């Protein structure tokens, strides 16, 4: 991975998350489960769809008959006609092969960037109220119910609200 | 602390689709699209809604001259292109040279 | 046969909107470009990593 998130510090993907491309696995006393981040998933789908549409829609053609008929005394123009067809075949094949090769690399890195951004967005929200434990995972120093959980998914986590609750727990785990 | 962990991850499925990239070949991906067309219905059809002009036993020379092995169109007819099977032989039954055959074929194409 | 099409080849017509084809280089009508490519697969999802280990 270019950004080191997919197949990087997040070692593997989740098959339990089927409603989206990127999301979360939560765990609290109320239970545990998988959920997909609606905001980041939809913004990545739009880019990919635009990417596919751009490749296809920019190719606009018109009515044209390739077939040309020549006699046995018109070899040179027949060879000229063949030279035109073969040259177009080589040009289109090389561009099409390289376009897919380069864009496939771009698409995978695009997913890598989105996963990395989502982790950093959560990191900026929690700050020192949570401990990074690898695998793209956070451990809360304070209790976090279902309302607190989706509030991170909402994007509306209240750091000062649990700042003193987490700070007291922070200085006791580390002896 | 009472545990309460939250994780960030990506989606995975059982899809066996493999794509090729500039840096690595046969990378398995969750979803993919196909940009290449490789299937045909195997039938000559009606371009622009207008049926083509079929000759069969004759080439264009035979049909335009009226070789007895050929048919003719009495009513007002139209076509989008011309179909001439390679089995067509009954053209200029009387030996000779037909001038501007290729030119006339193109002008009669539609 | 008696079905409409927007592109025709000697091997048969194609009803597609993809920008590339590899059936026959000789076509009549509004047709995609002909290429020698065998597999043009464009990845839309991310790298599948369901492996448990």
């Amino acid at each position: 991975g270019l950004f080191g998130a997919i197949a990087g510090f997040i070692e593997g993907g989740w098959t339990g998350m089927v409603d989206g491309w990127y999301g979360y696995h939560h765990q609290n006393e109320q239970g545990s489960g998988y959920a997909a981040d609606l905001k980041s998933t939809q913004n990545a789908i739009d880019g990919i769809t635009n990417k596919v549409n751009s490749v296809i829609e920019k190719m606009n053609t018109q009515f044209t008959a390739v077939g040309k008929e020549f006699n046995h005394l018109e070899k040179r123009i027949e060879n000229l006609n063949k030279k035109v067809d073969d040259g177009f075949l080589d040009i289109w094949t090389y561009n099409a092969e390289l376009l897919v090769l380069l864009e496939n690399e771009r698409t995978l890195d695009y997913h890598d960037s989105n996963v990395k951004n989502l982790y950093e967005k959560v990191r900026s929200q929690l700050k020192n109220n949570a401990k990074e434990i690898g695998n793209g995972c956070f451990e809360f120093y304070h209790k976090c119910d279902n309302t607190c959980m989706e509030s991170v998914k909402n994007g509306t986590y209240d750091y000062p609200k649990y700042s003193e609750e987490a700070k007291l727990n922070r200085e006791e785990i580390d002896s | 602390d009472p545990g309460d962990t939250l994780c960030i991850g990506y989606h995975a499925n059982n899809s066996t689709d493999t794509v090729d990239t500039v840096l690595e070949k046969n990378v398995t991906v969750t979803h993919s699209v196909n940009l290449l067309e490789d299937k045909h219905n195997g039938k000559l059809c009606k371009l622009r809604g207008v049926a083509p002009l079929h000759l069969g036993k004759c080439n264009i020379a035979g049909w335009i001259l009226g070789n007895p092995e050929c048919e003719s169109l009495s009513t007002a007819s139209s076509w989008s292109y011309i179909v001439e099977t390679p089995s067509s032989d009954n053209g200029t039954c009387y030996p000779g040279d037909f001038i501007d055959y290729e030119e006339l074929r193109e002008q009669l194409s539609s | 046969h008696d079905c409409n099409t927007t592109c025709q080849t000697p091997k048969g017509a194609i009803n597609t909107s993809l920008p590339f084809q590899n059936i026959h280089p000789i076509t009549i009508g509004k047709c995609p470009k002909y290429v020698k490519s065998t597999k043009l697969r464009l990845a839309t999802g991310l790298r599948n990593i369901p492996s448990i280990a």
Partner: antibody, heavy 121, light 108 residues
Framework: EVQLVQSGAEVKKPGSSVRVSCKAS??????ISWVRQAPGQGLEWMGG????????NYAQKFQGRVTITADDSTSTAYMEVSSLRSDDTAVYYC????????????????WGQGTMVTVSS | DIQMTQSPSSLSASVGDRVTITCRAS??????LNWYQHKPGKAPKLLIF???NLQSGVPSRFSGGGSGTDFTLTISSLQPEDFATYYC?????????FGQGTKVEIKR
């Protein structure tokens, strides 16, 4: 731009099934959503499909009966509903998520022309 | 799921008047509301999506705004063309529910 041409109006009897076509004038991979309006009632989104994410998201009411599908090469969308009943006698629409921004998932954008479906014995 | 409640149920004006239609949601949909106009016997048309961003081709008189749960669609001056029914649809989560309906009549 691309233009949407839906299939023609069709009338059937209860218990049968029907599939509705949605052909694109050009070629595009924008998302697909189907919306129904019953006579004298408001609009009602039925389901949707994401060509690049696969899958087919439907509504709770229509899950099980409707089957929304699309084909890539023809850029044609298909909406099939089984176990037809007199409650489904309405006009059905086909829309593609597309604005000046781009794919813009969620918004109907370009619409079709409608398709009258009548169910009665 | 989300319950889109449009107010008023019906209304009427006499061309050139200022129009305002309110749409309320049960839960919070941030800014994922879209406004559509439906005409008798004609396909629905999108006007405002994401509570803003007037669709290409829609005249500037149609202006939308709002966030959270309460949204509002406004028309500066009413014209003969925009006499139709207006629907507000959410796209924050599936299913994507439309509004109940808000019909517009020419006053007489």
């Amino acid at each position: 731009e691309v233009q949407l041409v839906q299939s023609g109006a069709e009338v059937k009897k209860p218990g049968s099934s029907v599939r509705v076509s949605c052909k694109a004038s050009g070629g595009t991979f924008s998302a697909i959503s189907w919306v129904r309006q019953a006579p004298g009632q408001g609009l009602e989104w039925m389901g949707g499909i994401i060509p690049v994410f696969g899958t087919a998201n439907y509504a709770q009411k229509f899950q099980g009966r409707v089957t929304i599908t699309a084909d890539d090469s023809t850029s044609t969308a298909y909406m099939e509903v089984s176990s037809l009943r007199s409650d489904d006698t309405a006009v059905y629409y086909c829309a593609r998520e597309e604005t000046w921004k781009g794919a813009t998932i969620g918004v109907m954008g370009i619409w079709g022309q409608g398709t009258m479906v009548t169910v009665s014995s | 799921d989300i319950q889109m409640t449009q107010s008023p149920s019906s209304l009427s004006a006499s061309v050139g008047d200022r129009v305002t239609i309110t749409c309320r949601a049960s839960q919070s949909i941030s800014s994922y509301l879209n406004w559509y106009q439906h005409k008798p016997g004609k396909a629905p048309k999108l006007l405002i999506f994401t509570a803003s961003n007037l669709q290409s081709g829609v005249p500037s008189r149609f202006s939308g705004g709002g966030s959270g749960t309460d949204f509002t669609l406004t028309i500066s001056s009413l014209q003969p063309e925009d006499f139709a029914t207006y629907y507000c649809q959410q796209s924050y989560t599936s299913p994507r529910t439309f509004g109940q309906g808000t019909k517009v009549e020419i006053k007489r």
